Ligand binder design. Structure first.
Ligand SMILES: CC(C)S[C@@H]1O[C@H](CO)[C@H](O)[C@H](O)[C@H]1O
Length: 461
């Protein structure tokens, strides 16, 4: 029973609210370690909590691996986005983070710690602004500014540290020394003047991916991503990811969940309570599966409930009602199907002869109000009005779940088991183009005309 409810505050095995905001995760041995920070009462750094788990749903409290007592500096400061990486050679765990005075944000510096054990008390080292000795000046202070940060371990066992420099306008990817505890050089200056923060660096199949989240304080914004074959250069443009608010959250870390069947990259972010005028500790979490259509095309769907099976390594949507359905048209007598039963995103939806195929089976997930989400079985995408069109003849396709109103449908009973399925965006019904009665009939969107080609019957399976 590994189901997670997004937009809420998870609870550990003890029954207490988990407090690991802006944190990350590490997979070592047989355990997944969730690190993160949380303010106390003065909105200052209290400690960096640590949770262990095997199922990724039931978390176990392990205490503060880093405390405000670990160092004199930590007695009064701001610490955000603490990440931990493993060093194969040494056998210890290096921890990076973002450090501030607690009075202001002039001290854009990073901080380092480490420990022989994962859930053990880390020993604070030093806070500093990278590249201090080079003598380079960044806004009046020694060393490049370093705010929003994150860590990454390449296949060749080389450590990397990413952070926002030059007033969060540029992203600096620093290459770490073999011990991961120091900066060896500035690998590359990525996305200059683009002003991206909250970076997440990962790799899949010889391709590096960089997930960002613009920069709009607490208020959620349009998240984007990019790819490249090399960390040094060859980076692509910023392609939009998720919706206009990243599903009311901000990216924090992305970890590959490997299992028996395969690997499913997990996305996790924060729904900062600051959005509605709340303390950091009241912030909620949002976990979603990061799907890869292709080596150059990424997908970040929004599932109100996510099911995870770490053992098999599968992250998919949780369907409250497993009841299958097929939508038969009154006029043609054919059922709703996906063109060529394809599972390619944005696939055209067409009518087809009832052949008991998977492509002709659909779930009905309630999404509030009198509207519902029509999801396919073979693929798992939702019925979507292409490009949120509000005009007649608007093609219907199956697209990644994005909580858009162009994916919510209301059923209006007209009798004899037939309904008029209207969209929540404009209110136009699901229409069979040109009253087609043959296979491959294009399913579209059209205003209510009282036609029989607009009436659909709900049939169990
Ligand atoms: C492309 C954006 C302006 S709208 C975007 O288009 C997609 C299909 O291409 C889906 O229909 C999404 O639901 C829709 O929001």
């Amino acid at each position: 029973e590994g189901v997670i409810v997004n937009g809420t505050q998870f609870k550990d095995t003890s029954g207490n609210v988990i407090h690991a905001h802006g944190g990350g995760m590490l997979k070592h041995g047989d355990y997944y370690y969730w690190y993160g920070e949380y303010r106390d009462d003065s909105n200052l750094f209290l400690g960096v909590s640590c949770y262990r788990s095997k199922d990724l749903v039931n978390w176990e409290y392990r205490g503060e691996v880093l405390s405000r007592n670990s160092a004199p500096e930590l007695n009064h400061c701001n610490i955000e986005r603490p990440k931990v990486m493993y060093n194969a050679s040494t056998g210890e765990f290096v921890m990076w983070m973002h450090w501030e005075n607690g009075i202001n944000y002039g001290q854009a510096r990073a901080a380092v710690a480490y420990s022989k054990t994962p859930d053990g008390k880390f020993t604070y080292i030093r806070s500093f602004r990278p590249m201090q000795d080079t003598g380079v000046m960044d806004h009046g202070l020694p060393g490049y500014m370093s705010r929003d940060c994150n860590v990454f371990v390449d296949t060749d066992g080389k450590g990397y540290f990413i952070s926002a420099a030059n007033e969060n306008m540029d992203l600096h990817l620093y290459e770490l020394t073999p011990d991961y505890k120091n900066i060896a050089s500035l690998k590359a200056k990525l996305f200059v003047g683009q002003q991206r923060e909250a970076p997440c660096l990962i790799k899949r199949n010889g391709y590096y991916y960089l997930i960002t989240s613009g920069c709009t304080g607490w208020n959620p914004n349009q998240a984007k991503y990019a790819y490249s074959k090399d960390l040094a250069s060859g980076w692509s443009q910023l392609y939009n990811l998720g919706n206009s608010t990243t599903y009311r959250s901000q990216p924090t870390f992305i970890i590959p969940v490997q299992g028996s069947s395969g690997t499913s990259y997990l996305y996790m972010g924060d729904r900062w309570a600051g959005a509605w005028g709340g303390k950091v500790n009241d912030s909620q979490y949002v976990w979603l599966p990061l799907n890869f259509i292709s080596d150059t095309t990424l997908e970040l769907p929004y599932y109100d409930s996510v099911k995870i099976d770490a053992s098999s390594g599968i992250i998919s949507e949780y369907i409250p009602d497993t009841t299958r359905y097929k939508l038969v048209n009154k006029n043609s007598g054919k059922v709703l199907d996906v063109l060529d039963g394809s599972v390619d995103n944005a696939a055209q939806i067409v009518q087809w002869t009832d052949n008991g195929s998977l492509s002709q089976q659909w779930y009905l997930v309630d999404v509030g109000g009198g509207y519902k989400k029509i999801v396919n079985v073979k693929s798992g995408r939702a019925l979507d009005v292409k490009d949120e069109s509000k005009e007649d003849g608007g093609v219907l396709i199956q697209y990644t779940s994005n909580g858009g109103y162009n994916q919510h449908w209301k059923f209006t009973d007209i009798g004899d088991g037939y309904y008029k399925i209207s969209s929540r965006h404009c209110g136009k019904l699901i229409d069979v183009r040109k009253w087609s009665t043959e296979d491959g009939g294009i399913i579209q969107q059209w205003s209510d005309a009282g036609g029989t080609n607009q009436h659909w019957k709900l049939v169990l399976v």
